[PDB]
Design a protein around this ligand. Structure first.
Ligand code: NAI
Ligand code: NAI
Ligand code: FNR
Ligand code: FNR
Ligand code: SF4
Ligand code: SF4
Ligand code: FES
Ligand code: FES
Ligand code: CL
Ligand code: CL
Ligand code: NA
Ligand code: NA
Ligand code: NA
Ligand code: NA
Ligand code: NA
Ligand code: NA
Lengths: 418, 156, 419, 159
């Protein structure tokens, strides 16, 4: 019955889909979910062929909400070209700074996620599925465990689900403090009971994943779309937002805004609109100085008119929007990003291992005003050289945001070199 | 000579039986142990390894890798304080200061009585509610010292 | 964002409880309220049984601040002995002359009220609560609507509040000009979409109220105490002021004082102290002639050393203090009181209907020097004869203040009998 | 040319919102009437029949409610209602000075409307702001009267 205490993150939707229930800050149990027509998409799905479901998800143009925006249908297609058995994994590791969109689905509308996992699993022929939830989401973990039992009792999980002949078990695994275990191959390693060490890709999981078998990894948000696609059909879904970047997307907005929280919006929304139209503008009506796209990118106040889509010029990513205003020290903020990568490199690759450490170590000296000229030159050098030989995206991006602050706010860095 | 008490051994056995393969339950088992003792006893690792059918080596490596597990310090209540960008921007330092005022400890330290340990952590995925902290499994936004004091008084 | 213009009523407290935030003349939103440890009392309440909360409120000695001073915990106990469902009503009709104490809580610290409502509703098992706010408080209405939304967003209202299993929605209704809709049964009639006609009591609302179900009606100020009782505990609360009349009380002071406004004070304070120690004394340092306790009582300058408590010899009421000084015409002031009751009788009862009107009608003639002997004797008679057959407090009291002025200021009235 | 009265859609929507707010439709009667008065500057008698239909109440019920509640006005259209408190405290502290100043500025007395339909003076009982006596409202805005020059400046804000 009782769960650990959760802060009641604000949530708003113009689309009333992913946040239809999760916009209210409490657990929605199966009866309330069923009352809203929940699990009818599953029933429909089980009356369809796996191939047909893949087809609909493909034609929906659904993309991954885990940050890379990879077409979900195409991913599934790849998996089913490979002999079974196959595995389905729901990625609930959500640990990138500023990003708290997935947890509100987990904690408030677990059946939406579960229903999505069951459909997705059926589509790719997986009889065994996993949720990997970070260990710092203990309430989400217990909520999911209880929801799964509820689903079992109403006959949505187990053997021969609703007479369909399809069997499914969903196991819930917990992380234990490593951001890198959100990387799909390191997640799989952790599920296999090992340290979270990414594997060289290719192969991609859909070719070789859990126990070496075809495995689809999708983010919570991605999977939560699937019931809607089956329910509405792909045509109506494609009618949501702009025709190319169609469908709902979640935007966790934090920092110097009046209304921090998660916003369910179409992807033609601009960054400026997220901040000023939806999130209520800035604290104290101060000027926006920068937006940090999690720990990935830094947008200046001259880049607010971009769409929140997966276009070349679009915001992309997980739609994470951290707002800094005119008073916030960019170098101090960059330090916090450096600290994050320092604390999360898994250490496999030498430039990443030493690079993330030295970036933080040197940047701290710069910040405290204890950096020699050599420390300055060294900082510049190491920021440009975390990436070489790296086998996953962390190494590839650990210097990216900080580099952007150096390019976009030179005058503020210059003052530190004094 | 170290052996788990039965009520814990039961729980560990439930985790080990939960996944298709025993070794998948390693992290659930270690959380359970840390919950029970208030840290990971070095001596706990050998019998755990036996139940997982894994080398001790493997288990030690896993404990070392995963930051949530603590082998050094027993504490009844872990106050995990977020030190990442958003919480820092919105007043992590006010929270830590308030914590020092109430408990008399800084991050990394345990109260003399072994009751409270302050653990600095990366983003807890609650950034809209910055600055964030947890007390064991419970998570909160910090509003003020008076507010923090009342929350902490709930843990005896 | 933007609310209608409100006068900045002065507020002062020696206790720093009800007016801790409302002493500053602005809206305190949920973030400021949370910073002050707001909603922690709710969290504490939800881990107690309803029965325990009632017991605490009972033991606190809390009495209604709506005017009658009825023990709040006892009222609650009466409700919960009756089968559910039950309803909880916050009475924000505040329309008694001189009375403006409730509005500053509403308009400045809405979350204090809301928190009190949620705790009180939980205590009596009400899953639906109402605020009935008078129509001439539009700002309060908008402020409350927004505050309720803030509370919903933070999960203090809705279904399964903080995992407790307790459900609550608070509806905000608006009055539309009738003083009698502050009478608890006419208020309920109004909430049911009808004219504000009081019902015969008993039954009291706690037995039969909204839709005939057990209903607790409590005043704004009453409800605003509830968070403190839970937060501090009943024992520590009962330590405030005299042990027989414990806790904060709000005193709206107006008229010929230097510092008119709302004062939060313990109930052992005397009326003299309210005027001279707190409200800065009189305008022009003139002598006090009289104090009107709203439109209820008239105290003379010989009665200033009474306690502001609910004792037989105490000031009682809503603690409303209207000061008149030596040059203020008592008969003119009496006329205004008569005019008030004339304009507010609901007319259901015959002596109230015709008496409120005739009292005002004849007194106007007296004031204007146009009263016959018959009008004089008529006025005297009607003033003594508003109450018969009355089914609510308005008829019971419409002659009371005026009668007190006749007894306490005979020389002034006689000046008019000649005229 | 003359057709049955119909609520403009923007008003109808607002009314429907109030009706949907409480558990029972008929609880919304006063909020609906406030809404109608806000929109038209009074309660049109012809508005009551469709309002009654929306509340699923008899017309005479609605008419009796409108008659009972003093804030509602079926008689005079006015853009701005200047509600002047005529109760004991405001009387003591200078209601008569406020009324005089109002007459000087607007040329109207209590109960009257300016020829342009802009302002109506409405005498009301205690407004619950007695410490700031003498008190008046202009629609929802509420003020202490200080002087004619000060009043004139306040009224200039309503156009
Ligand atoms: N949601 C969150 O909390 C977090 C999000 N991220 C995001 O992670 C991103 C980097 O992620 P990656 O997985 O390395 O991206 P990626 O581009 O390599 O792959 C994205 C997905 O598409 C699949 N894929 C790509 N090409 C494929 C192919 N040819 N055949 C089969 N499958 C293919 C991958 O297996 C993976 O599932 C960053 O953009 C960052 O924003 C990072 C941290 C946390
Ligand atoms: N705050 C303001 O603006 C105004 C305040 N008032 C005050 O109203 C007062 C008169 O109010 P009433 O409600 O007629 O007073 P009352 O003495 O009849 O009742 C007071 C409360 O106690 C309850 N109660 C009384 N006896 C009870 C019993 N046997 N069982 C259960 N509950 C019982 C009533 O239901 C009510 O809620 C006056 O003293 C006056 O000051 C009047 C007008 C406006
Ligand atoms: C260091 C690091 C960390 C993470 C990731 C990547 C990298 C490089 N990815 C992305 C992940 O590898 C993968 O692309 C997605 O889980 C695939 O799901 P979708 O296609 O987005 O539905 C990722 N994805 C996700 O769903 N949650 C997470 O917490 C993370 N964390
Ligand atoms: C004519 C008339 C008018 C009013 C009242 C009475 C009468 C006779 N009462 C008192 C009301 O009926 C009831 O006693 C209280 O609302 C109960 O709350 P408390 O016990 O004081 O918290 C009253 N109470 C209140 O809280 N606000 C008000 O505006 C009024 N108005
Ligand atoms: S790039 Fe960094 S985080 Fe990724 S596998 Fe290599 S060392 Fe580990
Ligand atoms: S006493 Fe007067 S106000 Fe009360 S119900 Fe009777 S007529 Fe109405
Ligand atoms: S930065 Fe602290 S919870 Fe995200
Ligand atoms: S007497 Fe005028 S506001 Fe009270
Ligand atoms: Cl071994
Ligand atoms: Cl009819
Ligand atoms: Na949540
Ligand atoms: Na993790
Ligand atoms: Na006010
Ligand atoms: Na009223
Ligand atoms: Na009662
Ligand atoms: Na006493």
């Amino acid at each position: 019955r009782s769960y650990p205490a959760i802060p009641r993150i604000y949530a708003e939707t113009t689309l009333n889909m992913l946040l239809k229930r999760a916009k209210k800050p409490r657990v929605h149990s199966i009866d309330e979910y069923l009352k809203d027509g929940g699990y009818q998409a599953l029933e429909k799905a089980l009356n369809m062929s796996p191939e047909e479901i893949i087809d609909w998800v493909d034609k929906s143009t659904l993309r991954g909400g885990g940050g890379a925006g990879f077409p979900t249908g195409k991913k599934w297609k790849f998996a089913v070209q490979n002999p079974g058995p196959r595995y389905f994994i729901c990625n609930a590791d959500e640990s990138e700074p500023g990003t708290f969109k997935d947890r509100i689905i987990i904690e408030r509308d677990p059946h939406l996620l579960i229903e999505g996992i069951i459909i997705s699993s059926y589509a790719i022929g997986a009889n065994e599925a996993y949720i990997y939830i970070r260990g710092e989401y203990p309430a989400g973990y217990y909520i999911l465990r209880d929801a799964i039992e509820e689903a079992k009792k109403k006959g949505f999980l187990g053997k021969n689900i609703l007479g369909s002949g399809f069997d499914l078990e969903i196991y819930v695994a917990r992380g234990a403090g490593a951001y890198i275990c959100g990387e799909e191959t390191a997640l799989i390693e952790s599920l296999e009971g090992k340290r979270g060490h990414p594997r060289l890709k290719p192969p991609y999981p859909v070719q070789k994943g859990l126990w070496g078998k075809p495995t689809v990894v999708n983010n919570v948000e991605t999977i939560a779309n699937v019931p809607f696609i089956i329910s509405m059909g792909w045509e109506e879904y494609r009618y949501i937002g702009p025709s190319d970047y169609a469908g709902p997307k979640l935007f966790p907005v934090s920092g110097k805004v009046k209304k921090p929280g998660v916003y369910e919006l179409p992807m033609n929304t601009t960054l400026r609109e997220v901040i000023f139209k939806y999130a209520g503008g800035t604290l104290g009506n101060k000027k926006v100085k920068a937006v940090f796209s999690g720990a990935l990118d830094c947008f200046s106040s001259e880049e607010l008119d971009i769409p929140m889509d997966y276009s070349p010029l679009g915001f992309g990513g997980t739609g994470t929007v951290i707002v800094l205003t005119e008073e916030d020290d960019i170098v101090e903020a960059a330090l916090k990003i450096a600290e994050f990568y320092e604390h999360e490199t898994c250490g496999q690759c030498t430039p990443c291992r030493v690079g993330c450490y030295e970036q933080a170590n040197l940047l701290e000296k710069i910040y405290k005003g204890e950096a020699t000229e050599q420390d300055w030159e060294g900082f510049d050098f190491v920021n440009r050289n975390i990436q070489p030989t790296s086998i996953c995206g962390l190494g590839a991006v650990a210097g990216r945001l900080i580099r952007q602050t150096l390019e976009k706010f030179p005058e503020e860095w210059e003052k530190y070199r004094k | 000579e170290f052996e788990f008490p039965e009520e814990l051994k039961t729980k560990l056995q439930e985790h080990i039986n939960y996944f298709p393969k025993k070794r998948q339950a390693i992290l659930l088992c270690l959380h359970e142990i840390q919950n029970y003792y208030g840290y990971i006893p070095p001596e706990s690792l050998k019998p755990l390894a036996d139940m997982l059918e894994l080398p001790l080596n493997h288990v030690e490596g896993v404990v070392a890798f995963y930051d949530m597990f603590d082998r050094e310090d027993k504490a009844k209540y872990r106050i995990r304080v977020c030190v990442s960008i958003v919480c820092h921007l919105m007043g992590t330092n006010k929270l830590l200061k308030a914590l020092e005022n109430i408990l008399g400890i800084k991050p990394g330290e345990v109260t003399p009585d072994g009751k409270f340990k302050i653990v600095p952590v990366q983003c807890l995925g609650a950034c809209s509610e910055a600055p964030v902290f947890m007390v064991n499994d419970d998570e909160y936004k910090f509003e003020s010292e008076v507010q923090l004091n009342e929350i902490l008084s709930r843990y005896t």
